[PDB]
Symmetry: C4
Subunit: 388 residues, 4 copies
C-alpha cells in the first residue's frame, strides 16, 4: 500500500548541484538515439525518469530530416531511465502526443497527451496505463500544456492547459484530475496574467506554477493552486526578468502585469519562491536560447525596492546551446527537494549546427542547503561529427 | 493474490481517442526493427502489450526479402512494450507461430500458437509460460485462429479456431480452455454463419466476437459466447458493411446470412455492439486495405429499417495504408473499456511501396464517453527512405 | 517463501510439440547477435531461460573469425530470454566458462562453470549469484561438464563432471551440491559405463541422465541418481542407437556395455525413459550433425527381443544442420513435463557454410499426452546472406 | 524489510577464482559499447553490478577520440549488469561524475560523485536515487575519491576523499555518511601516511582500506576504520611492494612510512589482510600497467624478518594490459567473501594500441578456501580489428 503524495513544504536550499546528464546527442553519433524535444523529469516512489516528446525517428536517419516541426502524428511521449539516452532498447511509449505533462500521485502515474489537428486537438488523460478521460479543444487553436511534470496533492492532480493564439489573448485553464477523472476546471483569472503557456510547477504546501507569457511579458506569470482552486496569480516581481527574449538587467518591477517590453515570444522556464526571495532560471543570452544560469533575487518575489541578484550560478556557458527548462520535485523526509532540468537543443535552427534534424540532450540539477562549486555542463557534441 | 477476470459490462462510450502509436517502420530505417505482421494488443493487471507474428528477420536485411509469405517455420509470436517498435533488445518470444491468440485470465497469460505444415499443423496452448495442451488439425487445411486477443471469464478462456478452405465451407470451432487445459469445444452452428476467420472479441457480460467471412460475406459474422457454450450467432445487421472488399453504402441488411455480394476475400476487422446500435471499423476504401475509419450505425445491431451512420471518425486517411484491425479491452472500475488497434502494412504487395519486404506498424484507440477531436495517424514512413 | 523442488514423476506424453525458436542466426545478419555454442534451457518458478557459452564476440565481426575453437578465456556462460536471440541489450553474464551446467533448486540458481588452462582448469560453483565452492581438475585434462541443466531434488543438486581423455579411459564423477556447497562426490562405477560426457538429465522421481560415450559407444550411457548416491548405471538397451556417429538401424542390443561399433566420437544428446520404453533424440544422419528426429522404441529401456521404433517425429530435415540436444523439465501440477532443445549449428566446419565463424540458433519442443502434427523447424539462415 | 549490513569478519580463503568477465572491448568492435574507465564492482541484496565512469561516447565513434582525458563534464557514473558490456540498451546513469564511489548499506545504494572545474569541484551524495548532501572542494585541487566501492556498517557508510596535489602533500579525509547525510569527517592522521588516493576498501569486522600513495610510496598506505573513527593507519609492511611503479623484489619493509623509492606516481590497487599475512594484487611489470598477479606474503601485514611470497597467482599475463584493481565483498552466511576486479585498459597511451580512444574491459575474481587452478584472462581484443 502507498499513500497519496502530501502537501509538504519545499526543503531549504542555497544552491544547485549537478545531478544526471544524458549526453544523448554525443551518444547518438551512430544513429542509435531517438529524436526528441521538450524533455522533462518526474519521479515516482522508486525512480526518477526522463520524459520527452519523440519524433518517431532515429537521430541522423533520413526520417530525422525536418524534425524542427513542432506537431506531427508521429510524435509520442516517451519515458526512459533518467540520465540515459533514449534508444529503442530502453524506452517506453506513454501515449501519442505533441504536447504533454506527467505526474505521479503516490500510487499511479497520470499523463496528459495532446494530439490531432491544430484546429481539433484533444488531450487524452492516462492514469495507471489506462485512458480514463479527455479534454476537447474548445478554442480550436493548438490545445497545449506544460511540457513538464504536473503536481498531485492528496490524490488530486493539477495541470495547466492553454487553447488559443500564441501572440494574442488566449484561454488558460487549470484542470483538477483525480485517479484519471476530470473533477473540474477553472479559467485562470485575467486580472493580472495576460498570456500563459508551458507552466513549470512544484509543491511548497500549495502548488506553484511559473510559466511563459508569449505575448507581452518578458517577466514570467505565476499561479498558486491547491487541490480545489486557484488561490493567487501574478507575474514574478523580480526586476531581473527571466524569459527569453527579455530586456537587459535591471528592467521593470512588474508584479501584476506583463512587462510590455521584449514581450514576445518566450521560452519555457521555471523558478522557486523562497520566502520573499525568488530563484529564477534563464538563458545567459537575453535574445537567444544559449547558456543557462540560475539567479537568486533578494526579495524578488515581492513588491520591493530592494531586488538584488545575490547569487548567480552559471551552469551552461553562453557559448553553448540551451533550450527549455522546468522544475521537478523529489520527496525528502518531510519536505520536497527542488530540482530542475535543462533541455540542450542541437540542430535546426541553431546557427552553425549544420544538420537537417532537431533534437536535444538533458542535464539536471538539484537544490541542497550547501554551497556549490562551479563548472559547465553543456551538450558537448561536435556537430561536425554527426550524421546530418 | 489476483482474482480471475469477471464478466463485466462494456463501458459507455461515444467516440474513440488516440492511445499508443509505435512508428515502427519509421524507426526501422536503420535495420533495428523486427519484421512483423498480424499484430494485436492485450493487457494484464500491470501493463498493456503489443503482440505480433515476427518473421525471424530484421527489417531491411536480406532475410526480410519475401516476407509477404504468410507461413514459415521462422515465425514466432513476440511481445513488446505497447507503442514501442519491436527490437532485439526489448522483445520476448512467446512461442513458434504463424497464427495466434493471447489473453490474460486475471492470474496468468494464455496463448494459442499454430505452426507446422499446412496439412498437419498443431496449435500449442501455453499457460503461465508452460505448454499445457494442444489442438491437432482435423481438416488438415491451415488450422488457424484469431490474430487478436481471446477473452477469459471467471477463469475460462474462449478462442475461435478454423480449419478448412479459405473460400469454401470450412470447420469453425470455439474452444474453452481453463488454466491451459482444453475443457471442451463446439462446432459453430452453420444455420447463419457460412464462413468464419480471425475473430475480434471483447467482453460485454458475455464474450462477443466479430469476425471475417472470407467466402460469401461482405458483412461480418458474429458470435455471443459465455463460459460454457455459444449462445447466439449471426451477421452484423448493419446495411453499411465493414469487410474489405465490400459494396458501396448502403448495401443489404443481412442479419442472418452472408451478403453474397463482394463476398470474397476479406480482412480482419472488429466492432462493438452498443445497445441496438453497432460501431464498426473499416478501411476507407471498399476494395483495398487503405484508410481507416470507425462508424456508428444507429440500430445497426438489429433488424430495422432505420440504419443510419450517425458518426464517422476518419483515423487513417485513404491516402495511407491500413490492414488488420482488432478489439481489446481494458478493465475500468466496474466495466470494460473498448479499445482497438490498426495494423498499418507497408511493403509488398502495396502499390508503390518499392521494397522487397512486408511489415507493419501499429496505432491504437480507446473509447470514452466524451466527444473526440480529429486527426490522422498513418504509418508515416517515406518508403523511399527505407532499405529495400 | 518458495519450497525446494520435489522428486516428482515425469508427466505422461505421447509426442513432442514446437515450443520456442530463436532464429538467432537469421536475426544476426546485421551483427547484433552474440556468437555462441553449447546452448541449453532451464527454468525457474517464473521463467524459462536460454543459456549458452558465448565467445566474447558479435556474429560477423572480425573477432568472430575462428570461433570454432572450443576453449578460450573469452567464453562466458550467458543467459537470455527463451526464444530470443542473444544481444548486448538482453543478455546476462553468469560466469566465465567454456563448459557449464545450470539448475534452479526452487529457491535459487546454481551454476557450474569451468575455465582456465586445459591442464589446470577449475569449476566455479555459483549459487544465488555468489561463488560458493569450486572443483579443481584432478586428472589435469579438460575438466568438463553437462552443457545442459543439472537437476535438484529437495535442495540437493546433482551434476556430472568428467576429467581425462576424450578417446580413452577417463574419470567420471557425480557431485552433490546443496545451497552451493559441495556435499560429496562419487566416482561413477565403471562396471558398465566405459566413457561418459555431456549428460542430459531430467527428473522422474529420481534423476536420470543420458550421456555421450565418446570412445567405444554408439549407444548412450545412462545413470539413475537420487539426492544421496548413484543408484543404477548402464547403456540404453535400444538396438536403435542414438549417438552420432552410429551404425545403421538396427544395431546391437547393448544394455551393459558400449556397442564397440562406430564408437567414437559422439554428440551430446538425450532421452526419456517411459515405462519399459524409451524416447531417444538423434541426428537424422548416422555420420554427421544434420537433421533431427525423436524416436520412441517399444521396450527400448530393457533387455528384450521386441524393440521396435513405434514413432518417429522428424523435426529438422536432414537437409538442415543440427548439433547438440538436451533435456529440460518444466513443473506441471504433480509431475514434470519432459522438454528438449536442439542446437542448430551454422558456420565452421559445416560443408558449404562459407563463413569464418561458428555459432548456433535454438529450437525447443515439449512433450504432451496428445498426438502431434508435423513440420520442419531448421535454423533457416541463408548463409550467403551473412557477414563472413 | 531489510536490515542494515553488519560488521562481519572476512571469510577464510586460500586462493582466487575467475568469476565474471565482460570482454567489452571485443564486443565493442561494431561501436555498440560505451567508452569507460575506472570501473568497479559492488553488490546489493539481489545482484552484483558493474560500475564505471563513462565518457559520454560510444567506442570507435568520432566522439571517442581523445578519451584518455581524465575529467570532462560528459563523464557519468554508470551501472550495468556484472560481466556484461555497457551498452545504451542495458546501462543506468547514476550521476554526473569524473570520480566516484558506490556502496549498498543493506537497504539503499549510496553514491559519491565528483564533477565540475578542477579548482571548484563538488561531490554529490546520492542515497536511494535522491541527492541528499554534498562536499565542496576545500583545497580547490581536484577533489576526488575511491573509484571503487565504499563500505557501510550498521547503516553508516565510510568513504575516503582527497583534495590537493598529485605529487606533494595533500589533504586526505574519511567521511561518515548515514542515509545520505554527512555525519562527520576526519582528516587522516599524517603521522604515517604521507599521500593517499583511490582507496580500495573491504570489511573484516572493521573497514580496511588499502590505497595509492602517488608521491613517495611504492608501498601502499592503509587505514582501519569503524562506524565512528579512524582506528589505525600505516603502510603495508610487506617488503614485496605492490604499487606501480615499484622496486624489484625484495624492497624495504616499511610499515610506518612511504618507501621513498620509485615513489611516484602509482596505480589503484588492493589487498586483503589475513591474520598476520597479507594478499596483494599487483601488475606483473614493476614499471607499467601490464599483467596482473596476486601474491600472498607470509607475515606481510606485520613487522617481521620472515616475509616470503608463499603464493603467486598470475591472472593476466605480462604480455597483456591491465590497469586499476579494487576490492569488493559479497555477503556469505556469517562472513564477507573477498573479491576483486581488474580493469583491462586498451587504447591510449598503451604502446601499439593504435587507436584514438581509451577504454577498458573488466575481469573479476573471488576468494574461496580451496586450491585454485591456473589460466590467463586478459582483455582479448585484437586492436587491429577495432575502429580507431
Ligand atoms: C482538499 O484537501 C483537503 C485536505 O488538505 C487541506 O486542505 C487543502 C484545501 C489545502 O489547504 C491543504 O494544504 C490542506 O492540508 C481536504 O479536506 C479534508 O476533507 C475531509 C473530508 O471532508 C475531512 O475529513 C478533512 O478533515 C479535511 N481536511 C482538512 C484539513 O480540511 C479536501 O477534502 C480536499 N478536497 C478535495 C476536492 O478533494
Ligand atoms: C533534408 O531534406 C531536404 C528536402 O528533401 C526533399 O524533400 C523531402 C520532403 C523529400 O521528398 C526528399 O526526398 C527530397 O529530397 C533536402 O533538400 C533537398 O535536397 C535535394 C537533394 O540535394 C535537392 O534536390 C532539393 O532541391 C532539396 N529540397 C529542398 C526543399 O531544399 C536536404 O538535402 C535534406 N538534408 C539532408 C542532410 O539530407
Ligand atoms: C460458468 O460461470 C458461472 C458463473 O457465471 C455466471 O454464469 C455464466 C454461465 C454466465 O451467465 C455469467 O455471466 C454468470 O455470471 C458458474 O456458475 C457457478 O457455479 C458454481 C458451482 O456450481 C456455483 O456455486 C455458483 O453459484 C454458480 N454461479 C451462478 C451465477 O450460477 C459456472 O460454474 C461456470 N461454468 C464452468 C464450466 O466453469
Ligand atoms: C529479393 O530477392 C529476390 C530473389 O532473390 C533470388 O532468389 C532468392 C531465393 C535468393 O536465392 C537470392 O540469392 C536470389 O538472388 C531478388 O530477385 C533477384 O535479383 C537477382 C539480382 O538482381 C536477379 O539475378 C534475379 O533474377 C532475381 N530473381 C527473381 C526471382 O526475381 C531481388 O533482387 C531481392 N530484392 C532486393 C531488394 O534485394
Ligand atoms: C534425501 O532425501 C530424503 C527424502 O527424500 C526421499 O528419500 C530420497 C533418498 C529419495 O528416495 C526420494 O525419492 C524420497 O522422497 C531425506 O530423507 C528425510 O530425512 C529427514 C531427516 O532425517 C527425515 O526427517 C525424513 O523423514 C526423511 N524422508 C524420508 C522419506 O526418508 C534425506 O534427508 C535426504 N538426504 C540428504 C543427504 O539430504
Ligand atoms: C579469418 O581469419 C583468417 C586468419 O587471419 C589472419 O591471422 C589472424 C590470426 C589475424 O592475425 C589476421 O589479422 C590475419 O589476417 C584469415 O585468413 C587470412 O587472410 C589473409 C587476408 O586475405 C591472408 O593474407 C592470410 O594468408 C590468411 N591466413 C590464413 C591463416 O589463412 C581469413 O581471411 C579470415 N576470414 C574472413 C572471412 O575474414
Ligand atoms: C557504531 O556502532 C555501534 C555498534 O557496533 C559496535 O561498535 C562499533 C563502534 C564497532 O566496534 C562494531 O564492530 C561493534 O559491533 C553502536 O553502538 C550501539 O549504540 C546503541 C545506542 O547507544 C546501543 O544501544 C548499543 O548497545 C551499542 N552497541 C554496542 C556494542 O556498543 C553505535 O551507536 C554506532 N555509532 C554510531 C555513530 O552510529
Ligand atoms: C583524433 O582526433 C585528432 C584531432 O582532431 C582534430 O582536432 C579535433 C579537436 C577536432 O577538431 C577534429 O575535427 C580535428 O581533425 C586527429 O588528428 C588530426 O587529424 C587531422 C586529419 O588527418 C589532421 O589534419 C590534423 O593535423 C590532426 N590534428 C592533430 C592535433 O594531430 C586524429 O586524426 C583523430 N584520430 C582518428 C583515428 O580519427
Ligand atoms: C507553437 O509554439 C509553442 C511551443 O513552442 C516551442 C518552442 O520551442 O518555443 C515548442 C513547442 N513544441 C511542442 N510542444 N511540440 C510548442 N508547442 C506546440 C504545442 O507546438 C509556443 O509556446 C507558442 O504557442
Ligand atoms: C491464408 O490467408 C488467411 C490469412 O490472411 C491474411 C491476410 O493478410 O488476408 C494474413 C494471414 N497470415 C497469417 N496469420 N500468418 C492469413 N492466415 C494464415 C494462417 O496464413 C485468410 O484468412 C484466408 O484463410
Ligand atoms: C573437446 O571436445 C569435447 C566437446 O566437444 C564438442 C563437440 O562439438 O563435439 C563441444 C565442446 N565445447 C565446449 N564445451 N566448449 C567440447 N567440450 C570442451 C570442454 O571443449 C568432447 O566432448 C570430447 O571431450
Ligand atoms: C589525476 O590523476 C589521478 C587519477 O589517475 C588516473 C590513473 O589512470 O592514474 C585515473 C583518474 N581518472 C579519473 N578518476 N577520472 C585520475 N583521477 C582523476 C580525478 O582525474 C591520480 O590519482 C593523481 O591524482
Ligand atoms: Ca548498427
Ligand atoms: Ca515573453
Ligand atoms: Ca468477405
Ligand atoms: Ca560415441
Ligand atoms: Ca606510488
Amino acid at each position: 500500500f502507498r499513500p497519496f503524495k502530501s502537501p509538504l513544504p519545499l526543503c531549504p536550499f542555497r544552491g544547485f548541484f549537478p545531478f544526471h546528464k544524458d549526453n544523448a546527442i554525443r551518444l547518438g553519433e551512430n544513429k542509435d538515439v531517438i529524436v526528441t524535444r521538450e524533455p522533462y523529469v518526474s519521479c515516482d516512489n522508486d525512480n526518477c525518469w526522463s520524459f520527452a516528446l519523440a519524433q518517431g525517428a532515429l537521430l541522423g536517419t533520413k526520417h530525422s530530416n525536418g524534425t524542427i516541426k513542432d506537431r506531427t502524428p508521429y510524435r509520442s511521449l516517451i519515458r526512459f531511465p533518467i540520465g540515459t539516452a533514449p534508444v529503442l532498447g530502453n524506452y517506453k511509449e506513454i501515449c501519442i502526443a505533441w504536447s504533454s505533462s506527467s505526474c505521479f500521485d503516490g500510487k499511479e502515474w497520470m499523463h496528459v497527451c495532446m494530439t490531432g489537428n491544430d484546429n481539433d486537438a484533444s488531450a487524452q488523460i492516462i492514469y495507471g496505463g489506462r485512458m480514463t478521460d479527455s479534454i476537447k479543444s474548445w478554442r480550436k487553436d493548438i490545445l497545449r500544456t506544460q511540457e513538464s511534470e504536473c503536481q498531485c496533492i492528496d490524490g488530486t492532480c493539477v495541470v495547466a492547459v492553454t487553447d488559443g493564439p500564441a501572440a494574442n489573448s488566449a484561454d488558460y485553464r487549470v484542470y483538477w484530475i483525480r485517479e484519471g477523472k476530470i473533477i473540474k476546471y477553472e479559467n485562470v483569472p485575467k486580472t493580472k496574467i495576460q498570456h500563459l503557456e508551458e507552466c513549470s510547477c512544484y509543491v511548497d504546501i500549495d502548488v506553484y506554477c511559473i510559466c511563459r507569457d508569449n505575448w507581452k511579458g518578458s517577466n514570467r506569470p505565476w499561479m498558486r493552486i491547491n487541490n480545489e482552486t486557484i488561490l493567487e496569480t501574478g507575474y514574478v516581481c523580480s526586476k531581473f526578468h527571466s524569459d527569453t527574449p527579455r530586456p537587459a538587467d535591471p528592467s521593470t518591477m512588474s508584479c501584476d502585469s506583463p512587462s510590455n517590453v521584449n514581450g514576445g515570444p518566450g521560452v519555457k522556464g521555471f523558478g522557486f519562491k523562497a520566502g520573499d526571495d525568488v530563484w529564477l532560471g534563464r538563458t545567459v543570452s537575453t535574445s537567444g536560447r544559449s547558456g543557462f544560469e540560475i539567479i537568486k533575487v533578494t526579495e524578488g518575489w515581492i513588491n520591493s525596492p530592494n531586488h538584488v541578484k545575490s547569487i548567480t550560478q552559471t551552469l551552461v556557458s553562453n557559448n553553448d546551446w540551451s533550450g527549455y527548462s522546468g522544475s521537478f520535485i523529489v520527496k525528502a523526509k518531510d519536505c520536497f527537494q527542488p530540482c530542475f532540468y535543462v533541455e540542450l537543443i542541437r540542430g535546426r535552427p541553431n546557427k552553425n549546427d549544420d544538420v537537417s534534424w532537431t533534437s536535444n540532450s538533458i542535464v539536471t540539477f538539484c537544490g541542497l542547503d550547501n554551497e556549490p562549486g562551479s563548472g559547465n555542463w553543456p551538450d558537448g557534441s561536435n556537430i561536425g561529427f554527426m550524421p546530418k
